[PDB]
Symmetry: C3
Subunit: 214 residues, 3 copies
């Protein structure tokens, strides 16, 4: 007979039976047209895709799920919709907090060594140098000599009966041109280093934005 | 005449010619309905997209290809389907080996300097401290002297006819209160360093997961 | 009446009124078929997706825009179409300049500290070693002594009345076996370091390509 259908899913593929009257046939035609106009109200051009391509839409693994992060080479004004700069401020659509990547690096973690989004390391933390002593040899000292000057007006008691003793009374120190044998030459005394070096050395980098999909 | 079609592609646009019998017209109607019901069996609501949007599905360059890798800001449990953690184990669908990114950084390469996925650099390789000696000056030595002591009971052979010589035999060393000239005062001696420092320094980073699309 | 329609959007859902002639009805049928054949020229199999999935195509937040950059684990030959190596050469389709990531690291910037694509830091900048001096103690000297050698034929003017002075003129240097008191033994003198160390120590990394979506 005749049925009420708004969308194509409600069409009855056997309704206009052979015994039905022709006076309703016109209505049937109208009905069919109506159905199409209620299912594709905006289609006006040719749809050239095939059935396989249309069925491929159902796959969702292709589509980018919320929560991924990317680095952005464009300006901040042209940031794509649904992506927020990874400033560490705010949460995503599902509530995951935005990580902070400003002036940092992506350090691959297993989720157990560090908490996700943890910021660590620095280019300049603390600095201190420290050597250690050198076992000096006799030649470590320079080619130095000790001048021999007898204190005051020294009168050495060397005669027949008294042993030779440089008995020097206080007074004008008689600087004789007497010298003692030089010792040492000023050789090389070497040390090791136990420097404190948390000063980080930044390798070559590039400056790019960081945006996480909302 | 009349045709039999399973899908809309087999509909004949000129079949019900003006010379055909009217008793077949009903059949035609049924046929049309059947065709639609076999081509869109799951469509029940309005489809508001336009032809251009539907034709855009054929474009695949925007679709993300297998083997792409990304940083994931969520937990390991909430990893999106089609992605595997960057543990360096296994291969992709097309056979690309999985690189290991745990505890590493993304080092941009041109494919000629290093092989893709190669792990280089380390936070601790080796260390050695090594200064060198200083060309010491005469004042490098501290304020030190050498006391004048005579070995044994040293007696000078100083008389009228014998040259004064402190000819001292073995005996009790009588140390007289004589002191030689001081040499030096202990000035500053500087060294340079030839340190061996491959011990890597960790710059600022952030802790995130890494997953590659299967 | 009868209308001229090429696509489904031009169909009049109320055209075949009840007062129209039967002789035109056949034409109506043809028209409908033609419309469908002109709207889906390539559909030849069942389309099992639902209305909601087709409607979801209109969303573009699901679509990765031109401009962002990704890192790639595959070979250079198998780079996906529409992606060009981030060699710093050229611009995108919308005009975003290509950053250079060869031998670089991703440095997150807020758009004010640095411009996009800025490169800094190096693996080998400069190196200088520099210790400092230490105030040497009196014990810093090694176990060294100075011999008491008398210049020339040294004779003391020691008589009964004349002060004993080792008045030694030039001549044969008479070396008496007299040794002055040794001082020091060469103990530990310690310093610090003020090394100039910008040579980059690259932390552990991995080698991955960098490609920008054109």
């Amino acid at each position: 007979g005749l049925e009420v259908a708004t969308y194509i899913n409600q069409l009855v593929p056997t309704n206009p039976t052979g015994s039905d009257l022709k006076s309703f046939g016109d209505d049937h035609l109208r009905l069919i047209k109506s159905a199409i106009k209620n299912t594709f109200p905006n289609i006006s051009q040719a749809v050239t895709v095939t059935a396989a391509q249309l069925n491929a839409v159902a796959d969702t693994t292709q589509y980018v799920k919320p929560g991924m992060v990317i680095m952005w080479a464009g300006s901040l004004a042209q940031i794509p919709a649904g992506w927020k700069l990874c400033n560490g401020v705010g949460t995503t659509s599902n509530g995951i907090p935005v990580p902070n990547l400003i002036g940092a690096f992506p350090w691959g973690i297993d989720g157990s060594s560090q908490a996700v989004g943890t910021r660590g390391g620095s280019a300049n933390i603390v600095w201190d140098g420290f050597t250690e002593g050198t076992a000096l040899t006799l030649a470590q000292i320079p080619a130095h000599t000790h001048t021999w000057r007898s204190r005051g007006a020294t009168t050495l008691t060397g005669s027949a009966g008294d042993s030779g003793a440089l008995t020097g009374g206080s007074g004008n120190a008689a600087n004789t041109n007497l010298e003692t044998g030089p010792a040492g030459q000023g050789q090389t005394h070497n040390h090791a280093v136990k420097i404190n070096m948390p000063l980080g050395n930044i390798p070559p980098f590039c400056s790019v934005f960081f945006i996480i999909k909302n």
